[PDB]
Amino acid sequence: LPGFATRAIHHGYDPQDHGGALVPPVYQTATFTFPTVEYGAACFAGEQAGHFYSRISNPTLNLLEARMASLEGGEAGLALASGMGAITSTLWTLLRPGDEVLLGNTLYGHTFAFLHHGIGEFGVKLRHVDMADLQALEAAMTPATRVIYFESPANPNMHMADIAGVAKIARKHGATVVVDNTYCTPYLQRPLELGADLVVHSATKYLSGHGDITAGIVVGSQALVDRIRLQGLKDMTGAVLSPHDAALLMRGIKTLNLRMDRHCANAQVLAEFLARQPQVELIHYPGLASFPQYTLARQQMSQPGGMIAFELKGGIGAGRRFMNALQLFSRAVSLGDAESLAQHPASMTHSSYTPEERAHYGISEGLVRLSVGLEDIDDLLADVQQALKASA
Amino acid sequence: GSNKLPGFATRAIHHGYDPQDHGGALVPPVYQTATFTFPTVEYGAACFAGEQAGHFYSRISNPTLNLLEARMASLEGGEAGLALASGMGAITSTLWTLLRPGDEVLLGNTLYGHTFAFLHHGIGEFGVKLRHVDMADLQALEAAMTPATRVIYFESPANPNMHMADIAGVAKIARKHGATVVVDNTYCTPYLQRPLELGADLVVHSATKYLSGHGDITAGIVVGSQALVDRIRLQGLKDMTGAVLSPHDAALLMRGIKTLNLRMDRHCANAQVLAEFLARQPQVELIHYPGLASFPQYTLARQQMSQPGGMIAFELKGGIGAGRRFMNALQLFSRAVSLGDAESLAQHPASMTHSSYTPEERAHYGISEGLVRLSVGLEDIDDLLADVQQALKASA
Amino acid sequence: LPGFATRAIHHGYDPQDHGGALVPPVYQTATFTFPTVEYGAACFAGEQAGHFYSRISNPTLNLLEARMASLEGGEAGLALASGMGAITSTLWTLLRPGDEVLLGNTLYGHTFAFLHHGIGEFGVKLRHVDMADLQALEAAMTPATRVIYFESPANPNMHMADIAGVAKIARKHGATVVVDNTYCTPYLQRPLELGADLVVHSATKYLSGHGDITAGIVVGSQALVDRIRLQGLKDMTGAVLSPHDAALLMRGIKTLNLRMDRHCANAQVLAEFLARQPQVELIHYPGLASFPQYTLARQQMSQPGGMIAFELKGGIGAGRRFMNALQLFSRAVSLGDAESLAQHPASMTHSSYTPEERAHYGISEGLVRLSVGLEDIDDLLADVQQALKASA
Amino acid sequence: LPGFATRAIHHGYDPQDHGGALVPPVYQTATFTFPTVEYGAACFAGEQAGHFYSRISNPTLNLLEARMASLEGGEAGLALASGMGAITSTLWTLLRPGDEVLLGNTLYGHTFAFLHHGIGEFGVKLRHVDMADLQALEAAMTPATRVIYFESPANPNMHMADIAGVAKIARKHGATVVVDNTYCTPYLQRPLELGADLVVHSATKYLSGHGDITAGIVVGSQALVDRIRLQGLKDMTGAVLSPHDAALLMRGIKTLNLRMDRHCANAQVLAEFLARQPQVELIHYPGLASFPQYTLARQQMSQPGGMIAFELKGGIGAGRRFMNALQLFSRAVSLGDAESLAQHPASMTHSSYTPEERAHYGISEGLVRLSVGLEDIDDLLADVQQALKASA
Ligand SMILES: CSC/C=C(/NCc1c(COP(=O)(O)O)cnc(C)c1O)C(=O)O
Numbered sequence A, C, D: 001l002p003g004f005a006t007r008a009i010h011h012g013y014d015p016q017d018h019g020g021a022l023v024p025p026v027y028q029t030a031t032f033t034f035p036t037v038e039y040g041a042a043c044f045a046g047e048q049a050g051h052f053y054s055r056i057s058n059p060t061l062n063l064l065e066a067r068m069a070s071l072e073g074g075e076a077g078l079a080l081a082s083g084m085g086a087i088t089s090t091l092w093t094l095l096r097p098g099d100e101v102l103l104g105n106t107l108y109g110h111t112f113a114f115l116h117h118g119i120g121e122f123g124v125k126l127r128h129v130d131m132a133d134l135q136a137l138e139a140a141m142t143p144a145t146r147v148i149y150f151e152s153p154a155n156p157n158m159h160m161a162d163i164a165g166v167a168k169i170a171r172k173h174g175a176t177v178v179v180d181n182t183y184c185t186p187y188l189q190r191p192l193e194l195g196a197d198l199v200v201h202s203a204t205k206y207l208s209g210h211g212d213i214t215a216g217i218v219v220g221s222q223a224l225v226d227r228i229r230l231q232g233l234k235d236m237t238g239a240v241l242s243p244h245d246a247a248l249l250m251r252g253i254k255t256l257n258l259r260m261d262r263h264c265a266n267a268q269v270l271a272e273f274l275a276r277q278p279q280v281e282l283i284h285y286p287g288l289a290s291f292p293q294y295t296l297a298r299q300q301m302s303q304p305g306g307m308i309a310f311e312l313k314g315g316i317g318a319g320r321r322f323m324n325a326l327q328l329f330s331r332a333v334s335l336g337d338a339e340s341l342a343q344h345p346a347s348m349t350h351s352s353y354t355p356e357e358r359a360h361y362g363i364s365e366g367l368v369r370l371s372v373g374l375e376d377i378d379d380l381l382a383d384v385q386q387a388l389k390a391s392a
Numbered sequence B: 001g002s003n004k005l006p007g008f009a010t011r012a013i014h015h016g017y018d019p020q021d022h023g024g025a026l027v028p029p030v031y032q033t034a035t036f037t038f039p040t041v042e043y044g045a046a047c048f049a050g051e052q053a054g055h056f057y058s059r060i061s062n063p064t065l066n067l068l069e070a071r072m073a074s075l076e077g078g079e080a081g082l083a084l085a086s087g088m089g090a091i092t093s094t095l096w097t098l099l100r101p102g103d104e105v106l107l108g109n110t111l112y113g114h115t116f117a118f119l120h121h122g123i124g125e126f127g128v129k130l131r132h133v134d135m136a137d138l139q140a141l142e143a144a145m146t147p148a149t150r151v152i153y154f155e156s157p158a159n160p161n162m163h164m165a166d167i168a169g170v171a172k173i174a175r176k177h178g179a180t181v182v183v184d185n186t187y188c189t190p191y192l193q194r195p196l197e198l199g200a201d202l203v204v205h206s207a208t209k210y211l212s213g214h215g216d217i218t219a220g221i222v223v224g225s226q227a228l229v230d231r232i233r234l235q236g237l238k239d240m241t242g243a244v245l246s247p248h249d250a251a252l253l254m255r256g257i258k259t260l261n262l263r264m265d266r267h268c269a270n271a272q273v274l275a276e277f278l279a280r281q282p283q284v285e286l287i288h289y290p291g292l293a294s295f296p297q298y299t300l301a302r303q304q305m306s307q308p309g310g311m312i313a314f315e316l317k318g319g320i321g322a323g324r325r326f327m328n329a330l331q332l333f334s335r336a337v338s339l340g341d342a343e344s345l346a347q348h349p350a351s352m353t354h355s356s357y358t359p360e361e362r363a364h365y366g367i368s369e370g371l372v373r374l375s376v377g378l379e380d381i382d383d384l385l386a387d388v389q390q391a392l393k394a395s396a
């Protein structure tokens, strides 16, 4: 009922319950005590029989979880030490040897490495499918298919999946659909509202917004999230989020809407500019009318995002020269920071892939990815302009 | 001369850090940053292409975590350290790296509840074979070694009954057959016991406990060879768990480590007095404290541990019934899990820390009904004695 | 010259100087060591001579100071433990027995109390003057007049001072002009560009933006700020800011432009709404055409701000009924949080005044002050609407 | 009464009142909200009547204050941003023009500068007396003597005052006794139990113990502490302590007894070593039988402390060479850290004095001060031994 910005500030917290504290106190405590051992045993017996209690759990983490659940429109949330923590805790819970996971064609490097060199080496079967192509996806479904996992838009080429289409297919086989919603955040896209079962985030990125914490979030139905908490997190990863970092993340979430509006406004201008430049061969930005999945993008995303990928005609050398000339944009991995960032993976940083896997899946050569920050657009334009000139 | 190793307390405070290299900051600055930037695109391919081949020295490693790691490595006498989000982070990152389907892991008979659950309901369900062996019985361990045995994993002393393994004995068997020995050294810390110096390959900690000392962070540490720690960093942590430690918490952990020697001295002094007191009170059936000659592995404890630790496991006459009345009358001790806190704690393993085990598994792996576990804290021993004294009275 | 948002994010820091750290590391250290004692002696010799040096000062604090100096367009900045730390350190440095200070007619309660019950009881003369009346100000000048101090807009009438007019007069008589710029922030108003010598802030408010730190800032000339640092702060108050809180304040400043845009947009809608309602006797909001100093406010402020003050018909009883009915606004003092706040200033934030002095210095009974937060405006409209119905 | 160590860990906190949190949550919030306005006005009515309330007060700071009060044996505590914050807030409250303050002959440099160049330029009269000479103190007393202020032992020569003897004189004449107890901590010396009215600390030093926060503490009667809070802190300094730093200080306090035991044990060995070395002319350590006030040290301090002062035969030249040679000790001001520190008081901590004021007030040009840390004593002896060789 209250609006997104209202919920991002207030959801799950009334100051009058914590001595009037306007900002909730930070529970930086590894443990909680009991009034009797009988009461203590009841807390662990509940958890031992699959029930999450909110007594032997941290109220700072609980509040972050409830708030993220509200923003994504899910039943329950789980906070973890990183995006990789969210992903691995989720998949280790849901998969066992002989199960199959159907994967988007393009994934974040460490997700790819986890799948191919981690869980995939313990007898879990993997298959990559184009998640926009529903007839290909339907034909890839097998009785072993238990999870469908993808990012949308897909890092780093912005390929989109048809989330409602995927969910419709999955539902015929009872398969669980997991969407990495890092790029969009719940402010731009809510995959659970389109039929996904679970969403994962690297909250290290836009949710934090300020580049100072590492964190992960899972949001979904109570039964799935409980199992990921009690098995994935507790037993299989130990990817515990610091209450300090959780509190900072909640601080970032309070400006999520305002930050995302600005990331998007800035990236729209840079995309319009780059699409016209002679040095630029191709560009991937969902807000351009020429984006191949323009219509699908606008069905799922309320705004076209803060990320741009493009390719320079001069290939790898031009890519390098462009990167090296940047003075305001920083040369770095990561995204979703106040500071604008750039990376040119042909100076390898989707490096978990071999050269042939990068070619087979959608990762190129003159390809530069920009995380457009919150700086004054006129300064960002000037920096991109002179770097483009230097790329000759 | 200058080739003398600085003492433990000196290293816990100074190792790896010279204020001169950070503008004279006496306390190292906290690198609370998710990412690091590059001067050129080429310095950057060099870090990531380099990380992929096998090596860790991505100079985009977090200096706060790196100092913590180097300091823990120095204290344990290992080549390299890795900092993680929790003790379970350290354990799972290690075992996910070292084991694949068809490998066998030999396990100590008694394990921390979530370690047991990880093994039996986690990695053991992905094709890794498990077998439990009494790691104090070297003949039984030898007999259990198979060509598929890849890892030997145990705690010493074990949570919660304080059963000991002969670490050098285990390591000798592991050298003959080829297995990697991993020791959970949480209870002792490097101040009391250094398994790597006894021939273990890797040590893991829940740094949440004594290393922190103050119960305000959750954290894990792995120490061992450069080769094994790099592998665990680059696969286990980076790909299989994501159990990343906050630089804020790493800095708090380092702060705690600066008083580790002084705190452990007081934990052990207090526990020795309390254990001697408890052994003489009418209501106590048995007491297991490594510092008493009644301790079943007294001489092994004396040999491996420089002091007998801060943990007491005991059992009242009255069984579990009296255990609950005793624990309920405590007024200074808190009823809580965890250990290695400044605050004294009392818990009941069978319904709390080892709730992950079934009842028959608890009977099978040496976890009794009636066991009361004390984590003896840093309070005035006369106050702790008075508290235990009055609670004993109320349990009668 | 880079834009405001760019400078709020980047000014004074290049990652390449701190091992590539994108976010500057937090120097949570009470002290710094010297390579030699001659080097150490030289540092202390510098500050005895009156000069400030970067070594033997904290880099986290120094960055915050440099960044605030850039945003206000001043030479030098100083960070302190609170707004009152900024104000007291400043006035303790600049005044001595027999000096006079001319004050705006209405001040923040603790500033008032400091002046009247603190430094004023140590032989410093005070006189209150309307700082929008240049002839009254000119008339009140004496050879002893050393400092002119005021807030603009002043709480909670929002009375504006003519900063450039006041400064012209001050330059003639050789007085130092100090402006408490808490309400506007450098994003809306830069009193140094209008001729002020020093600006002070409660950075606890909008600069932080998230209600989790207490902090103060002074900005002005190098010569003045050095004296305030070396005498007021080091000797007379000891109001030292934690590097942890300074880092959080910098995190807040990174979204200042975005947050102030939203605070202002929301406040405008509520002010316009309040003006059309029958329960409202009178409303003080700079952005309404009917505001008495509308033109002077537009000349000094780029936007009309996030603070609204107003009187209900029904006086104090209606005020109580309104406040006690609020369900989304919180009853609290403070301002400039993400959370919307409401208060009654006579019994709370100006409780340092006696009943004669509340009436003496334009502080009404029946006045309600709103700090309009960042929540969805439709939610804020709904809460104000239902609370007005409950006021009747 | 539970033991010191017990109280340092537990006093004032029951986990059961905060959902079983074993560590108290950190209230990192600038403000607190109200359930009604008349509730809010009751709190600020209370503060105008001189009464301190728990609501609109920070529970983290309150716990620190209660704990510090317990350890000193006092009724009430106050936490501030620095030791100078404690000192200034106290003296600004207690003194007015015409009042006389009697001072120990040797004070910390910024305390000296605050007195002579700050409050002493606002009409407060100052006189220095030897607080060990009770005849001379008695003879210096006047009816205008409002405050007697000293450190014991004094920074930096270790000269002591007989606190109970001074207190007797103060009671006869009607003066308030303020003792800076920074060097000893409550673990070694409790001036309130010897008749002092107030104690102040730089909690930056031993209480923190780890060199990572800046903080001050005042302890004394509820009557005095309330006045210092409501005037000195609220109005005259704004020296507000961060809840983050308060929480860290409480963390430090939990090991105070263990750290001080080690500091003192190391310092005794080092002092005994220094006493036998040919390069050393004189040493000031309370634990040596040769200390002029050995008997009074043993009466009044339970251990001789972690601080050593000594003079090298070769004067300032040898002092410099000694300092520059140290490899394990750091050259730094500050004290009470885990890390061992060394400095030259005349050019550093007492550089606010002129050359002639140092000569007059017992601050030699040749003095070296050591803050003996927690490192292995054999390592510290080796470093000192080589630096003594190098001093020639
Ligand atoms: C080598 S550091 C660079 C990391 C980047 N991204 C992270 C990320 C993760 C993993 O999230 P953490 O574990 O919190 O890092 C998961 N899912 C997505 C879509 C992500 O973008 C990056 O450079 O784009």
Ligand SMILES: CSC/C=C(/NCc1c(COP(=O)(O)O)cnc(C)c1O)C(=O)O
Residues within 6 Å of the ligand: A238, B086, B087, B088, B089, B112, B155, B159, B184, B186, B187, B205, B206, B207, B208, B218, B219, B220, B337, B338, B339, B352, B353
């Ligand atoms: C149910 S909370 C109680 C936890 C307790 N112990 C933890 C522990 C871990 C796991 O460490 P984290 O992941 O940091 O918690 C690993 N290894 C050992 C020998 C341990 O004791 C306990 O109550 O004894």
Ligand SMILES: CSC/C=C(/NCc1c(COP(=O)(O)O)cnc(C)c1O)C(=O)O
Residues within 6 Å of the ligand: C082, C083, C084, C085, C108, C110, C111, C151, C155, C180, C182, C183, C201, C202, C203, C204, C214, C215, C216, C333, C334, C335, C348, C349, D238
């Ligand atoms: C009784 S708590 C309410 C405090 C409020 N204000 C603070 C303030 C200060 C002092 O700033 P700190 O020292 O940081 O608090 C200075 N100058 C101005 C224009 C301020 O608004 C309040 O508005 O209700």
Ligand SMILES: CSC/C=C(/NCc1c(COP(=O)(O)O)cnc(C)c1O)C(=O)O
Residues within 6 Å of the ligand: C238, D082, D083, D084, D085, D108, D111, D151, D155, D180, D182, D183, D201, D202, D203, D204, D214, D215, D216, D333, D334, D335, D348, D349
């Ligand atoms: C020039 S920085 C070195 C400071 C030193 N001491 C400080 C101190 C203070 C003031 O304490 P803060 O305001 O917290 O720094 C008060 N009282 C005493 C007995 C002190 O020693 C020093 O090097 O001994």
